[PDB]
Protein backbone atom coordinates (compact mmCIF):
# COMPACT_ATOMS: atom_id res chain seq x y z
CA UNK A 1 0.00 0.00 0.00
CA UNK A 2 0.80 3.76 -0.43
CA UNK A 3 3.06 5.82 1.77
CA UNK A 4 2.86 9.23 3.38
CA UNK A 5 1.36 12.31 1.75
CA UNK A 6 3.89 14.78 0.47
CA UNK A 7 4.08 18.39 1.49
CA UNK A 8 4.55 20.70 -1.42
CA UNK A 9 4.67 24.37 -2.23
CA UNK A 10 1.90 25.63 -4.44
CA UNK A 11 3.43 26.32 -7.83
CA UNK A 12 3.13 29.75 -9.36
CA UNK A 13 2.85 29.76 -13.10
CA UNK A 14 4.82 32.69 -14.40
CA UNK A 15 3.72 34.60 -17.53
CA UNK A 16 6.12 34.59 -20.42
CA UNK A 17 8.28 37.62 -20.05
CA UNK A 18 8.74 40.09 -22.87
CA UNK A 19 11.52 42.66 -22.77
CA UNK A 20 10.53 46.29 -22.86
CA UNK A 21 12.58 47.90 -25.59
CA UNK A 22 13.46 51.58 -25.66
CA UNK A 23 13.33 53.12 -29.21
CA UNK A 24 11.05 53.40 -32.30
CA UNK A 25 10.60 49.65 -32.48
CA UNK A 26 9.60 46.89 -30.14
CA UNK A 27 9.44 43.17 -29.46
CA UNK A 28 6.10 41.67 -30.22
CA UNK A 29 4.85 38.37 -28.92
CA UNK A 30 2.75 36.26 -31.29
CA UNK A 31 1.59 32.60 -30.96
CA UNK A 32 2.65 30.19 -33.65
CA UNK A 33 0.17 27.49 -32.80
CA UNK A 34 -3.35 27.16 -31.56
CA UNK A 35 -6.03 24.80 -30.52
CA UNK A 36 -9.69 24.68 -30.13
Amino acid sequence: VPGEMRLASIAFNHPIQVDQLNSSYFKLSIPTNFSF
Partner: peptide
Protein backbone atom coordinates in the same frame (compact mmCIF):
# COMPACT_ATOMS: atom_id res chain seq x y z
CA UNK B 1 0.36 9.51 -2.84
CA UNK B 2 0.32 8.13 -6.40
CA UNK B 3 -2.74 6.07 -7.65
CA UNK B 4 -2.79 2.29 -7.32
Amino acid sequence: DTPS
